[PDB]
Amino acid sequence: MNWTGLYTLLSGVNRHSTAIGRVWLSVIFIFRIMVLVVAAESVWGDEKSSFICNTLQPGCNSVCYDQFFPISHVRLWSLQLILVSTPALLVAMHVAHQQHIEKKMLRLRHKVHISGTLWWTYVISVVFRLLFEAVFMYVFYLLYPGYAMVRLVKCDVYPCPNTVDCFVSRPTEKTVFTVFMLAASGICIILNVAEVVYLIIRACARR
Amino acid sequence: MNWTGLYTLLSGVNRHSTAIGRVWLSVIFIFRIMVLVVAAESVWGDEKSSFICNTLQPGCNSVCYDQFFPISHVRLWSLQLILVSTPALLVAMHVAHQQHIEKKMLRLRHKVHISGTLWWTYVISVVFRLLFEAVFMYVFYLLYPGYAMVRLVKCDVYPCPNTVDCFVSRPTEKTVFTVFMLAASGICIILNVAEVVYLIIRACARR
Amino acid sequence: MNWTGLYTLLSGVNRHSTAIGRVWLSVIFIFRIMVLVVAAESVWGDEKSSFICNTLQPGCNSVCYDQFFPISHVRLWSLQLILVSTPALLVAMHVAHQQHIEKKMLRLRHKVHISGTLWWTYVISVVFRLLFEAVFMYVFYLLYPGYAMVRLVKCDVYPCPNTVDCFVSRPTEKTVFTVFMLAASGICIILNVAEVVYLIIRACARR
Amino acid sequence: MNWTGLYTLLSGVNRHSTAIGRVWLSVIFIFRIMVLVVAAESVWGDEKSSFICNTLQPGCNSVCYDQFFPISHVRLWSLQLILVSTPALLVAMHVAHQQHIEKKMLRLRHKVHISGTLWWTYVISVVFRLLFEAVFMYVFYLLYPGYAMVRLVKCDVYPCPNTVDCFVSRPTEKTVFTVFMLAASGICIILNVAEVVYLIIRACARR
Amino acid sequence: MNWTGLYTLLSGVNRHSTAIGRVWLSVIFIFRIMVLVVAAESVWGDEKSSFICNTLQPGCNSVCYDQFFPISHVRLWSLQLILVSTPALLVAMHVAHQQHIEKKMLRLRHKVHISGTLWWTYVISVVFRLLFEAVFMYVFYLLYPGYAMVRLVKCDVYPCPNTVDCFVSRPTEKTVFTVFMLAASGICIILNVAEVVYLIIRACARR
Amino acid sequence: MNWTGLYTLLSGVNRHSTAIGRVWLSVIFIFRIMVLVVAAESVWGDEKSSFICNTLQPGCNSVCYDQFFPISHVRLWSLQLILVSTPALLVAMHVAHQQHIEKKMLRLRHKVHISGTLWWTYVISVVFRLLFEAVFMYVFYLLYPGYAMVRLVKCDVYPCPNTVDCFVSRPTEKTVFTVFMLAASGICIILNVAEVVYLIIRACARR
Numbered sequence A, B, C, D, E, F: 001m002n003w004t005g006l007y008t009l010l011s012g013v014n015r016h017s018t019a020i021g022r023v024w025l026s027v028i029f030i031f032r033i034m035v036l037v038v039a040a041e042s043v044w045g046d047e048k049s050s051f052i053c054n055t056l057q058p059g060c061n062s063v064c065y066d067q068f069f070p071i072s073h074v075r076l077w078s079l080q081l082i083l084v085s086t087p088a089l090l091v092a093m094h095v096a097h098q099q100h101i102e103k104k105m106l107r108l109r110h111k112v113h114i115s116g117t118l119w120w121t122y123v124i125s126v127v128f129r130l131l132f133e134a135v136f137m138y139v140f141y142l143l144y145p146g147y148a149m150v151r152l153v154k155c156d157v158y159p160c161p162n163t164v165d166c167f168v169s170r171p172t173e174k175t176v177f178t179v180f181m182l183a184a185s186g187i188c189i190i191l192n193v194a195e196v197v198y199l200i201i202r203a204c205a206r207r
């Protein structure tokens, strides 16, 4: 493991990419990876047996948990992270494939066309990344009204005869980790807008 | 780890393979791997103790779970993934073996024949991949009428004296992950049809 | 990780080995590895607490489980896999050792003798592999009359005062995975017979 | 794995960095990593079921645990460690990116400017590291009045009808590991002040 | 991973070592590693909660388990394996150190002396390995009269008021795995005697 | 993985280090690593639920366990091992840093001074290692009067109304593993004294 190799892996042999992404976006993406895995290993965990409802009836607790938290925070962040990654992986594959084609041509203008098409691919990939980030932020807003978790809820549903007051397990730390992940996603959003506009302005300067 | 090595590993030193698979199919296959492992680690888990049936009788819960969910979603996707992989692995082995034979010949026309047989092998492998995907989609349709999971079921079987209303653990997220996996499989299906027809059309153009 | 390295590792720098094993047997052996690990991680698991017997008496459940399933399917397949591997590992060690001896001779006819003895070693190793496969198939037949698992059993043994009807946990999926593993083992058996007879016929053709 | 590679990875190809950090800070940071992971694997663990409150009422124990320990020690140290790392990772990315730009220039004064800007980046990164360390120490002081853990607490909150005397699981070892981590963080603080002042004094000596 | 590297790692750049060990002992040692890890992961497991004694009194079960099985089979095999390994590791270190000394001499008869001392070291190491194997076999004989495990035991000790009939969890498979490990250890014993006597006879032939 | 690389990693490119450490201390340190991890995975485990006290009152068992075993054996050995390692890691960092400085000088007597300072660093590091070992042995003596574990204890503390006789889980194997670890630490102590005195005597011989 060396820093040149790690940097190249994060970048992807993309000569069109600017410093902004290459350094800052790679760094904060690694930060997202770290915070995502440590927190899931640490606080949410199974995040089902921790949820406690005062009812002796079997099954009421699970139904009630399901009602109040349809999709978990950590699974949503993991899905967001994979879906964000796929565009960048696609661009890296495109460049790796194109250089291989060039090599096979050598073994047995056009180069300018290759350059231009790669530029367009990179721009569209960054746009898709931005769109995914924004959509996931909107889903977060829709699912949970507020950043802080709710400690006390009332549970009036089948098969629970009376409304039962029911409690969440570890709200305070989930709030902190939620804030961290949300801030990381926002930073990514602004970085991506800045990167796209920078590319367009540089292209205008060239012509 | 470098992008050239990863790209070559995903492709397999197959000069006949087109850009379509090499880039897009590799990317979405990696996506399938990621979504499969994260979700199993996260939501399904043991996926047996989570299932709750209102009966104090021991064994009725397990019998009832077995009746309603013969084969799990995640195990079925994992089996599908392995079985899909085996054709591509076979083709990669074929090419690696043939180059070794060529080298041993060098140490101590035919080349054209090698090329043609490799082309035929690749086409048949892609066809087998398509067939496996379609068969697994059909099995999904047969096993579960609808994409959304059933929350409430009635359980009238031995050794359960009365029909017991019985509940599933985490349906909402299982629905989302089911949709993601199904969409990935469908994308693979269309990609594979397109790749095969592209190869045939290119061969026709050559002659 | 590259395909040439993986292919060489699976083969073992054995110039006498034919295409049959090198490609097909390596592929289906990798398939056996994958199916063995995924299924054990997934369905059998601890495969003891899942077994449920209707008796409140402590210890009767474990005694009864032990009576009906002396050796588990997955442990038996794992043992089979290790024992099958050891011959091939032995042959790989033999070739690696012999090339080292040749190098030390260089540093400080016979070559033909080396070739012949290596050929004989390979043939005997393949024969041993075939024998191990057949023996394990016979043990499977002896232990379990049928491929499908038994859901309901009657348990009349100490310290269980009455015969208790007792249930298996997840039979339907265990049946499917059993079929997959058995088919893989059979394919290996036929491949091995074919490989040995091919070597003998080629030797006859040479002379 | 070799010592030159590990040393370069810890340092980051930063010619401006002094011996102080390169050796001592790398060593004690590795020590922090080791102590953090071993202790979490060992003593804190799930650190929730271990907490015992004398109440048969379900949910009172979790509410009470949450009140007394809002954020765990180990999660706080892990977050501190990630957040401390991010600056150094950023500087390593900056240098790796700049050398790549220089290479692309070669393929197709300024060098002095590159050197100076890298120096400024390193100084600011070390300052940020110091600030993060100090902030986390302050949070430790605020959250817990004393280094030693409290064995006995009184718990008078909803839904617990009477104040219940409630006990912590493993205080003595948590105290020891707390002391170790705190001492490591303090050593880092002093090292960082010394490194920054050394750089400034050396710059003054140069001019 | 390549076969030459694996073979060299197993051997240890020891020119005095004979074919016997280099191939066969390496192979069966790898077999011991595999069988040890798979079985522990699979059957013994925690091997404490599985043990069931018919007593409602808390603590009687653990005391009784401790009385009947002082040291587990799997831990004993693991300790045997580590202790067996240490001699071979020591010899490998000796040769690696001596070649480094020779290189440092080159940078700035005796060679014959180096050869002889290395030969003596190897012989004594093999003798120590044999002794460790024999001692561990004797301990196995002492601890357990027979290879087959005991299903039923009587437990008359404090704090258990009456002698309780108490049962073992999974005896049949433990018997099989015990036989496998014992056979491997015996094979190692004979191999080691043969290797030592072969070295001595070859030395006599030389002189 | 090769023996030269492993040997260099264990040694650390230290030309002043003698054969004694390089071979024997590396070997027995690897032995300490192995015995530490296997035993913790195997016998101690969670080492809390295994402890059984005859009291139905919740919390009395944990309080009593805490009183009798303030710090666990395995955590203490792990801490000892990390703390022992840090000096050697520091020396390795020092040498790696110094060679890098020499290279940067080459790119753009003193050498004798470098040699001498490195010698002094190595001697002081070995002394610190010896001191850490001795301190940890003393702590072992203080915490536990005897090597063998205590099976039966009496527990008279809050909130336990009567003194309860309370039992340890697996004493016999903990005794064996304790003896092994203690013997390893002692061997290290003697080795370290011998190494330091050997260096001093050799220096006297030089002058």
Ligand SMILES: CC(C)CCC[C@@H](C)[C@H]1CC[C@H]2[C@@H]3CC=C4C[C@@H](O)CC[C@]4(C)[C@H]3CC[C@]12C
Pocket: A009, A010, A011, A021, A022, A025, A026, A029, A085, A088, A089, B006, B030
């Ligand atoms: C500027 C930022 C956003 C770039 C981030 C690029 C990241 C997402 C890229 C760089 C290298 C990639 C990894 C390369 C190799 C593997 C191993 C494979 O078995 C699963 C996917 C995985 C783990 C890839 C996931 C995506 C990845 C981590």
Ligand SMILES: CC(C)CCC[C@@H](C)[C@H]1CC[C@H]2[C@@H]3CC=C4C[C@@H](O)CC[C@]4(C)[C@H]3CC[C@]12C
Pocket: B009, B010, B011, B021, B022, B025, B026, B029, B085, B088, B089, C006, C030
């Ligand atoms: C275009 C797409 C479908 C190509 C996908 C090819 C994938 C399935 C190939 C590429 C490299 C292959 C892997 C190469 C090495 C190993 C390690 C071995 O111990 C198990 C199998 C495993 C993990 C292989 C599984 C199949 C694999 C992942």
Ligand SMILES: CC(C)CCC[C@@H](C)[C@H]1CC[C@H]2[C@@H]3CC=C4C[C@@H](O)CC[C@]4(C)[C@H]3CC[C@]12C
Pocket: C009, C010, C011, C021, C022, C025, C026, C029, C085, C088, C089, E006, E030
């Ligand atoms: C044609 C088919 C049957 C060939 C199959 C050969 C397989 C069984 C060989 C090829 C490489 C071998 C592996 C090489 C390295 C290791 C690592 C070691 O720590 C345990 C054994 C293990 C994992 C070997 C097991 C056997 C192995 C997997």
Ligand SMILES: CC(C)CCC[C@@H](C)[C@H]1CC[C@H]2[C@@H]3CC=C4C[C@@H](O)CC[C@]4(C)[C@H]3CC[C@]12C
Pocket: A006, A030, D009, D010, D011, D021, D022, D025, D026, D029, D085, D088, D089
């Ligand atoms: C002087 C001290 C403070 C320098 C410490 C630098 C440390 C924090 C740097 C050096 C190399 C870096 C690692 C390089 C590679 C990876 C793998 C990646 O998948 C996650 C991050 C991770 C694990 C990095 C985390 C930060 C790291 C460990």
Ligand SMILES: CC(C)CCC[C@@H](C)[C@H]1CC[C@H]2[C@@H]3CC=C4C[C@@H](O)CC[C@]4(C)[C@H]3CC[C@]12C
Pocket: E009, E010, E011, E021, E022, E025, E026, E029, E085, E088, E089, F006, F030
């Ligand atoms: C002929 C037979 C008996 C030779 C057997 C030699 C075996 C025991 C040797 C060969 C290479 C050695 C391994 C080399 C590297 C490591 C990694 C280290 O972190 C722990 C020890 C461990 C795992 C060694 C244990 C001993 C080992 C496995």
Ligand SMILES: CC(C)CCC[C@@H](C)[C@H]1CC[C@H]2[C@@H]3CC=C4C[C@@H](O)CC[C@]4(C)[C@H]3CC[C@]12C
Pocket: D006, D030, F009, F010, F011, F021, F022, F025, F026, F029, F085, F088, F089
């Ligand atoms: C003669 C004896 C005492 C020498 C022992 C030196 C040992 C302690 C040295 C040699 C190589 C070192 C390892 C090198 C790399 C890593 C990976 C890192 O992520 C954590 C620390 C760790 C695991 C180091 C711990 C200390 C280490 C194991």
